Amino acid sequence: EFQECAVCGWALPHNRMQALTSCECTICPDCFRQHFTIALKEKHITDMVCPACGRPDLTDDTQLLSYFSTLDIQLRESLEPDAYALFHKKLTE
Partner 1 sequence: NEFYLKTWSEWEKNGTPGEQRNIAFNRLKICLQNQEAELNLSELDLKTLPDLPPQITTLEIRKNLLTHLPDLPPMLKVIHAQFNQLESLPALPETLEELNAGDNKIKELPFLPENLTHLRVHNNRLHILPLLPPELKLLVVSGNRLDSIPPFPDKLEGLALANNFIEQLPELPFSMNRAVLMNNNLTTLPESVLRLAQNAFVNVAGNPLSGHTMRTLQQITTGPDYSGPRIFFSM
Taking residues 3 to 42 in sequence order and writing x for each that binds partner 1 by CB under 8 A, - otherwise, the string is ----xxxx-------------------xx--x--------
Q: Which helix (H) or strand (E) holds 18?
A: strand 18-19
Q: 3-state DSSP: the chain helix, strand, coil percent, rounded to 5?
A: 55, 10, 35
Residue 46 DSSP one-character state: G
Binding partner of 23, given Zn ion, partner 1, none, CB within 5-8 angstroms per partner class? Zn ion
Residue from 20, 27, 40, 52 binding partner 1 (CB under 8 A): 52
Q: What residues make contact with partner 1 under the rule CB under 8 A? A: 7-10, 30-31, 34, 51-55, 57, 59
